[PDB]
Paper text:
Further investigation of BSP30 revealed that it is a mixture of two closely related proteins—BSP30a and BSP30b, sharing 83% amino acid identity, with expression restricted to salivary tissue. Notably, BSP30a and BSP30b are abundantly expressed in the salivary gland independently of one another and the proteins are secreted into saliva, accounting for 15–30% of the total protein in bovine saliva. From a structural point of view, the PLUNC protein family belongs to the TULIP (tubular lipid-binding) superfamily. Each molecule consists of 7 α helices and 6 β strands as well as connecting turns and loops, which constitute the conserved TULIP fold.
Crystals of a double Phe-to-Met mutant of BSP30b diffracted to 2.0 Å resolution with a space group of C2 and unit cell dimensions: a = 81.65 Å, b = 59.57 Å, c = 89.94 Å, α = ƴ = 90°, β = 106.25°. The structure was solved using SeMet incorporated protein and SAD methods. BSP30b crystallized with two molecules in the asymmetric unit. Electron density for the loop joining α3 and α4 is absent. The hydrophobic channel of BSP30b (~22.6 Å in length) is enclosed by all of the secondary structure elements. The internal cavity has a volume of 90.2 Å3 as calculated by the CASTp 3.0 online server and the cavity is lined by predominantly aliphatic hydrophobic residues. This internal cavity has an opening located adjacent to the C-terminal helix (α7) at one end of the long axis of the structure. BSP30b also has a conserved disulfide bridge common to the PLUNC family (cysteines 172 and 225) that joins the long curved helix α6 and the loop region between helix α5 and strand β5. The first difference results from the presence of a second disulfide bond in BSP30b. This second disulfide bond, formed between Cys72 and Cys229, connects the flexible loop just after helix α3 to the C-terminal helix α7. Intriguingly the electron density for the disulphide bond is only clear in one molecule of the asymmetric unit and missing in the other.
Author numbering:
A (entry chain A): 38 to 73, 80 to 238
B (entry chain B): 37 to 72, 81 to 158, 164 to 237
Write the structure that this text describes.
């Protein structure tokens, strides 16, 4: 079941792997130097370690995590969308059957950052990080049971449920936390550059 | 492994999970004694046994049927005793639910032989004597899904034969007196 994943996500998956918090602290530091491929590589490690815990709790094993490029798209002079594209390989295993499907995973995480207008002491507002099912894409690559066998659709739906739970419980919260660690002057500097 | 729950149940005895099993046993003993009917008590006993197995496993065996208990005299005072068993099997797995429907045939075979006591021979748990035929699967028959289902049912059926069905078969025959068994052998 997803019972073990539910409890793990309630505790926090970093309770299963103390190096997650260390990678988080490395990311915060690296980010403070934007305004003064390392960040992407820390994010790959972060996301990798998170999904490594998930593999211990579930049959959904996500690895080969790549983050090609973090980008910022200005939506005004005072706000921008921050995009984190994620790709990964997924293998779903079930009891007795072993490996039932191999999938290509694409997840696009997006969060807005905004700077208050009409002051020289501008506060920063990090917007919500939304777990839109359209942001999660799974492509069937292989199944030793046959590509059109019913077990494939079971594997796909199980992987989407797992990824969606992990995005809501871990990735989006950490994304917001990282952006909230940036300096007001830094976010200001970044939003302007994205126009 | 997966059969740990079944194995412990077989260690305690499956009648510890369903008090009606022993009642049928006594009914059978009386029924057999009466022949000096039985098939229906036999169906009931085997059915209840597999209903306990379904509480301990994903292998659900029901619609149990015993056509005719055959007895073939091998001498003046000995005979081969055959109980053919047919049943419907559904195997379930976590997540996937029911993976395969199977046709089961089991042949329970022993010997009875005649101051003088009634000897009941071995009850051999031969996997040649367990036949599982695939009827239906949601996941096709090309796959290893059916293979896993068949192998699961075979091991469950095999364990229950050795742990429950063959010992009970021997006890029921041992429960007849030398005169009773002598009369039944003659009726061939
Ligand atoms: Ca909490
Ligand atoms: Ca990289």
């Amino acid at each position: 079941v997803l019972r073990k994943l539910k409890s793990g996500l309630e505790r926090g998956l970093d309770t299963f792997d103390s190096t997650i918090e260390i990678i988080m602290q490395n990311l915060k530091t690296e980010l403070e130097s934007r305004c003064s491929q390392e960040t992407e590589n820390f994010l790959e490690q972060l996301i990798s370690r998170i999904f490594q815990v998930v593999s211990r709790l579930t049959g959904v094993r996500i690895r080969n995590v790549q983050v090609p490029d973090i980008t910022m798209e200005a939506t005004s002079e005072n706000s921008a969308n921050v995009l984190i594209p994620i790709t990964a390989d997924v293998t779903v295993s079930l009891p007795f059957l072993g490996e039932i499907v191999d999938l290509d995973l694409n997840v696009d995480l997006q969060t807005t950052v905004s700077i208050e207008t009409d002051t020289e002491d501008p506060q920063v507002v990090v917007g919500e990080c939304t777990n839109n099912p359209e942001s999660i894409s799974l492509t069937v690559l292989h199944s030793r049971f046959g590509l059109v066998n019913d077990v494939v659709d079971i594997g796909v739906n199980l992987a989407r449920r797992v990824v969606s739970s992990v995005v809501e419980g871990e990735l989006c919260p950490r994304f917001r936390e990282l952006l909230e660690s940036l300096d007001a002057e830094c976010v200001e500097k970044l939003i302007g550059e994205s126009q």
